[PDB]
Design a protein around this ligand. Structure first.
Ligand SMILES: [Cl-]
Ligand SMILES: [Cl-]
Ligand SMILES: [Cl-]
Ligand SMILES: [K+]
Ligand SMILES: [Mg+2]
Ligand SMILES: [Mg+2]
Ligand SMILES: [Mg+2]
Ligand SMILES: [Mg+2]
Ligand SMILES: [Mg+2]
Ligand SMILES: [Mg+2]
Ligand SMILES: [Mg+2]
Ligand SMILES: [Mg+2]
Ligand SMILES: [Mg+2]
Ligand SMILES: [Mg+2]
Ligand SMILES: [Mg+2]
Ligand SMILES: [Mg+2]
Ligand SMILES: [Mg+2]
Ligand SMILES: [Mg+2]
Ligand SMILES: [Mg+2]
Ligand SMILES: [Mg+2]
Ligand SMILES: [Mg+2]
Ligand SMILES: [Mg+2]
Ligand SMILES: [Mg+2]
Ligand SMILES: [Mg+2]
Ligand SMILES: [Mg+2]
Ligand SMILES: [Mg+2]
Ligand SMILES: [Mg+2]
Ligand SMILES: [Mg+2]
Ligand SMILES: [Mg+2]
Ligand SMILES: [Mg+2]
Ligand SMILES: [Mg+2]
Ligand SMILES: [Mg+2]
Ligand SMILES: [Mg+2]
Ligand SMILES: [Mg+2]
Ligand SMILES: [Mg+2]
Ligand SMILES: [Mg+2]
Ligand SMILES: [Mg+2]
Ligand SMILES: [Mg+2]
Ligand SMILES: [Mg+2]
Ligand SMILES: [Mg+2]
Ligand SMILES: [Mg+2]
Ligand SMILES: [Mg+2]
Ligand SMILES: [Mg+2]
Ligand SMILES: [Mg+2]
Ligand SMILES: [Mg+2]
Ligand SMILES: [Mg+2]
Ligand SMILES: [Mg+2]
Ligand code: NA
Ligand code: NA
Ligand code: NA
Ligand code: NA
Ligand code: NA
Ligand code: NA
Ligand code: NA
Ligand code: NA
Ligand code: NA
Ligand code: NA
Ligand code: NA
Ligand code: NA
Ligand code: NA
Ligand code: NA
Ligand code: NA
Ligand code: NA
Ligand code: NA
Ligand code: NA
Ligand code: NA
Ligand code: NA
Lengths: 56, 73, 237
RNA sequence: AACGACCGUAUAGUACGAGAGGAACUACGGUUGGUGGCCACUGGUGUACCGGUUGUUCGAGAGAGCACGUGCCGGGUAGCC
RNA sequence: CGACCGAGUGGCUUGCUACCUCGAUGUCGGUUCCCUCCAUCCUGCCCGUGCAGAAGCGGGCAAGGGUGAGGUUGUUCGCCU
RNA sequence: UUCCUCAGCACUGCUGAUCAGCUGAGGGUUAGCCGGUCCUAAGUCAUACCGCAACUCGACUAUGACGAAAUGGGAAACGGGUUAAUAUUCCCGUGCCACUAUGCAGUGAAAGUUGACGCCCUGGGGUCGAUCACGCUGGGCAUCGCCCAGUCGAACCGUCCAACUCCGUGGAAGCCGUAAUGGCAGGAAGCGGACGAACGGCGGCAUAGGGAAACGUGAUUCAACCUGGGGCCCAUGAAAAGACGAGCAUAGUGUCCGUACCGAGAACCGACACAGGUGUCCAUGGCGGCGAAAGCCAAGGCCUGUCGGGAGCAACCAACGUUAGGGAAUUCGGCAAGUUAGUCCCGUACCUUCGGAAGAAGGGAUGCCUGCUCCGGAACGGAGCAGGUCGCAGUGACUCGGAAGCUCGGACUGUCUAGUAACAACAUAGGUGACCGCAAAUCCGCAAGGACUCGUACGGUCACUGAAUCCUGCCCAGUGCAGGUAUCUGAACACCUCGUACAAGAGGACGAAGGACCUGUCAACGGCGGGGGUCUUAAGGUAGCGUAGUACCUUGCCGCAUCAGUAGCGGCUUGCAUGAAUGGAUUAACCAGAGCUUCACUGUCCCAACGUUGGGCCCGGUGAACUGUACAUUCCAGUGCGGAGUCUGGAGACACCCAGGGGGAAGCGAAGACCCUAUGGAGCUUUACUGCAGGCUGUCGCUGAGGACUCUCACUCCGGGAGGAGGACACCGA
RNA sequence: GUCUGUUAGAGUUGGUGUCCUACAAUACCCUCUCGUGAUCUAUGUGUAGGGGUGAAAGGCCCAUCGAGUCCGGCAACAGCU
């Protein structure tokens, strides 16, 4: 079985969904944790310094 | 006996499965009554179809050498 | 390199755990306040998934229904006793002191009240030898002379299911079925059949260990493999 | 290359030669390799055609469809080879 | 038939060199299909002989045509029918 | 929103379009009894506690909550009708459950049963369906008289009960019983009784419903559903909610979320209207036959695996048919193709672990028509007999093994490089050694803590070898591990000497593990030579096997087999450089594993031919990409950085277009994987350099009373507790 | 962990066939293996990057593996083009 086209057929599992907090489609309905705003994991909003050039 | 194994496994393995199972399937005397009606129910479990006596013993024998010693002392 | 298999074990992932949720009961001696006035009747004989040996259900006077570590020769209806003055019959529990010298015993306690530690596998037993006011000697199934507190309880008789080791598994499928009822990753790949990055005996154009197999006790985990602190090896001499 | 080469017969059991053995010029007949063309003859094909027969559907009969591009089997004209 | 020593031609083997290509000139052997060389294996015509003949042996001119089938081996080569 | 209706063709559709999953505008999904919702599963999260420099980090322990829409458990709905589109939801008819209120009954009431369960063989009950017989209603057919369809009717309410179990009677010493096992004086058959099943029977439901009509009756085989018997485990096959237990009338309430459509060669994932991928149920439609197989045909769906038109339709290509005589000569090799085939009877070698080998091999039969026999209750089940009879051919198509031998490897089923390796590699049972008595051995974490472990030596960890059979020799010198150790060596603290008004510093005494030293150990790493009739460095190759998948010389020599055999097999064998669990020898069975031989077969070949289908060619429509410094009709030589269409000398050459097979553009495609270089990179190894974890040991702190000893009070562990064990050790910090 | 078997389902030996600007960034056809078990499969759930997982091939961890992917360090450094 190929890892390419023939393995794309079983993909009908829902993971990331619209988020109740930040509105982005990143709330993993299985983990119950938003990969964008950190909802479900952190009371504070997910944010990092590497999200921009160091001196900016 | 071990005829279900076909030409597989070799002499020793199918020879010991037979000897062990042959003695396991024999007629054993019930500790309760005394009728030769004891059968295996599973690993280490024995039962007399006559009086319904259900008891513990060896895995492939109702009585083991070590068990027969317990009485001596 | 990569962490070897024995290092993966410790993490305790699914593959390495035992199927506890599928296990029955924890066979431990019932805690009697005192007086020995505790007795019960054998209600049923069951199979124990954790030890591949029979075990027995008992109904105690005060209503307590529990599974017991069954010695050989126990049947439905038999009356069993537990306490300081339990009648000296097979299947009864009482401190090593009350047990007469020269009698085969099983499910022996390490420290009084722990519920039993030694001699509790298929067909084995400990031999009570010496008595004293302070220490009772016991010969464990490995042949070792273990000194114990006479207050350590035990059960008269040898464990049931004796002789299980007599019959061979014959086929891989049979091992497979048993292995699935224990906490162990099976089958087993030889260290030598691996790559150098995977195990200390790995690598090479042909299969053989690099250095000698006998490793030191002080060796670090990841390196401690083969014959551990071997006092000797072989069969000769 | 439109042609190359070989075997055989007569010459001759001759010339030569103690003997054993043993030719040639010439004239004939055929074979092989190559080359160009043709199908009366033999051969192949021939899902043109005609026949036999198995299974199934059209009620039977008659007559038909499907079974890989003929269900299978037998025969096979012209043409092409 | 032909040693020693001496003078050469070729560019098939092998060795030497590092000129050409490392932003790639696809390997060996085989197969198929086309052209060529002569240092000629056969075939034409010749010369000598330790050429009776017959069968040879050696040499000259000559590249029109021909030089095939198989057994082991990937083999080229080579051994064998 | 792709669903239905209407209106359209700029877009989308492999061509066109009046069509559309396209564009625009409207409309469409109705529930106490179908799901969700509730319960609990592997497991998840949150709070608390503790850790951590700290947290959005972290293991345990508490508590709480979450975790199943086809496919776990679970209170209750059937039939008919209706719309452009919904429907057990709406409408009509009938029925059912839960809660609450009222009223009669009841004082019972929670023990217990149920929910609730693995794999293999099987009996009995029994519906739908399929078929058979016969009657009735409708249709079809036109030499006959056959052929097709229909012949209906639920949930629910009531009632019936086989098997299992047990009671009474009875009184079997041999009988009773089964497909099989089995049963009995501890009481068999028989008779009687209690309990007790279907999604099944029967009655109602129903001058309900449906049909144009008739609106049937019996039977066989029987999915579903019900209910029993037997066998297996080094394997033991969920839980909780809930229900029953425990009546009846009447009445009221039963909210909330889902409901359209597709479910795939155009509605999902794959950039696409993609030949790919993607779970469940219909497994009982007919003939056929062993069959959920082939082939053919219904019901039902479709002509959308969506561009067409023309030319006996050439060359060439893809799939494929047939080829005389020869028959593997083809090739690395029989690659490709072919041969054989179903069923019944006869018959069957070596070897072997006695199972097997084996469908070995080899030989015979096979249709139709007529009348029959046997087994069984019977089949539209099976096994045979007699006579007749057609063909080239009777498993007539379809379906459907080619066979035998020698050698090598791995014992066998199994695993693997998703995407060039399926193997001899990995796994395996079997053999072996190692560690550990559990406050263990081994392993994970920074810590708090954790896996093994609901486990305890018949255990489980760490390794090697790799079924069976016969075996497994010698070496402890080096390396490794382990034990011992007079003596030697051996750090820091404390102590002593010197030094300094103190300190730095110098030296000394004592000495742990470690090392020296000695010993044990090779199924521990590994070794088993040269010389001569011992030397290195411990020993100096034993059974076996051998030109090996290991042998350079090598196509070794002899033999088999062939016309000829670097192959293959057998023997020899001084083995460049075989050999015993780095396992040796060997082996029945097994294999998409490597090599060789024979019979059979054949277009692999001699040597090619004709034919079939789809392209190719011409026509309408649609309509890309690769590549492009320039110039360019080239050829033969030469020259040049030594491999030129372009330079030099000649030769040839009127322009354009069609089809073709690919000689050249050192053709196009990729800043060479080979090789070297760079004070480039990465993975891996080690007795490389330098360090960091981890283990061991000494010392200080915790730490207390009286080089050897006693104690209890901190501290640790066992105990529910009382209390027990241990104890200044250990754990932890340095 | 028995046999035959395109029952369903799973697998992938050969054709080095077709395709190789594909129907397809692993496809098509025939042939072939397994098919009651160490079997196949849907859904749910766990293990995370020097870390998993691995009947061991350096196999696999979303077309990415002798150390995944994303962004940041970052305009890394090079005596090389
Ligand atoms: Cl085990
Ligand atoms: Cl639903
Ligand atoms: Cl039965
Ligand atoms: K180059
Ligand atoms: Mg991948
Ligand atoms: Mg315990
Ligand atoms: Mg497991
Ligand atoms: Mg192994
Ligand atoms: Mg390997
Ligand atoms: Mg390593
Ligand atoms: Mg090995
Ligand atoms: Mg046809
Ligand atoms: Mg080229
Ligand atoms: Mg000449
Ligand atoms: Mg010439
Ligand atoms: Mg529509
Ligand atoms: Mg319209
Ligand atoms: Mg819930
Ligand atoms: Mg359900
Ligand atoms: Mg509809
Ligand atoms: Mg619907
Ligand atoms: Mg389409
Ligand atoms: Mg022929
Ligand atoms: Mg040949
Ligand atoms: Mg040849
Ligand atoms: Mg073949
Ligand atoms: Mg009869
Ligand atoms: Mg046939
Ligand atoms: Mg060989
Ligand atoms: Mg194998
Ligand atoms: Mg591969
Ligand atoms: Mg394979
Ligand atoms: Mg492959
Ligand atoms: Mg192996
Ligand atoms: Mg082993
Ligand atoms: Mg073992
Ligand atoms: Mg030989
Ligand atoms: Mg040895
Ligand atoms: Mg080895
Ligand atoms: Mg380069
Ligand atoms: Mg290299
Ligand atoms: Mg480096
Ligand atoms: Mg504790
Ligand atoms: Mg099988
Ligand atoms: Mg099969
Ligand atoms: Mg899963
Ligand atoms: Mg490798
Ligand atoms: Na190695
Ligand atoms: Na020269
Ligand atoms: Na170049
Ligand atoms: Na070539
Ligand atoms: Na010539
Ligand atoms: Na040859
Ligand atoms: Na009924
Ligand atoms: Na049928
Ligand atoms: Na198998
Ligand atoms: Na040694
Ligand atoms: Na040693
Ligand atoms: Na050796
Ligand atoms: Na296999
Ligand atoms: Na042909
Ligand atoms: Na060309
Ligand atoms: Na690397
Ligand atoms: Na294939
Ligand atoms: Na990494
Ligand atoms: Na950057
Ligand atoms: Na640099």
């Amino acid at each position: 079985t190929g890892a390419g086209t023939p393995s794309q057929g079983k993909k009908n599992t829902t993971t990331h969904t619209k988020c109740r907090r930040c509105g982005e489609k990143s709330y993993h309905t299985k983990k119950k944790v938003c990969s964008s705003c950190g909802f479900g994991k952190s009371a504070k909003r997910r944010d990092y310094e590497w999200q921009s050039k160091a001196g900016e | 006996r071990s005829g279900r194994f076909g030409a597989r496994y070799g002499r020793v393995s199918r020879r010991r499965v037979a000897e062990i199972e042959s003695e396991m399937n024999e007629d054993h005397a019930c500790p309760n009554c005394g009728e030769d009606r004891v059968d295996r129910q599973g690993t280490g479990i024995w039962q007399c179809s006559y009086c319904d006596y259900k008891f513990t013993g060896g895995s492939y024998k109702p009585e083991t050498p070590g068990g027969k010693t317990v009485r001596r002392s | 390199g990569r962490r070897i298999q024995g290092q993966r074990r410790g993490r305790g992932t699914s593959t390495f755990r035992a199927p506890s949720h599928r296990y029955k009961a924890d066979l431990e001696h019932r805690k009697v306040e005192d007086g020995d006035v505790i007795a019960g009747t054998v209600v049923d004989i069951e199979h124990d998934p954790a030890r591949s040996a029979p075990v027995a259900a008992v109904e105690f006077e005060d209503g307590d229904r529990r599974l017991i570590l069954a010695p050989e020769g126990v049947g439905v209806g038999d009356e069993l006793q537990v306490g300081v003055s339990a009648e000296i019959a097979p299947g009864n529990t009482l401190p090593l002191a009350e047990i007469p010298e020269g009698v085969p015993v099983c499910n022996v306690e390490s420290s009084p009240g722990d519920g039993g530690k030694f001699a509790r596998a298929s067909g084995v037993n400990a031999q009570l030898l010496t008595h004293d006011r302070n220490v009772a000697v016991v010969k464990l199934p490995s042949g070792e002379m273990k000194r114990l507190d006479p207050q350590c309880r035990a059960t008269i008789g040898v464990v049931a299911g004796g002789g299980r080791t007599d019959k061979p598994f014959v086929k891989a499928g049979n091992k497979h079925h048993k292995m699935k009822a224990r906490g162990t990753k099976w089958p087993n790949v030889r260290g030598v059949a691996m790559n150098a990055v995977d195990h200390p005996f790995g690598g090479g154009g042909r299969q053989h260990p690099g250095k000698p197999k006998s490793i030191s006790r002080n060796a670090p985990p990841g390196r401690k493999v083969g014959d551990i602190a071997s006092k000797r090896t072989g069969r000769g001499g």
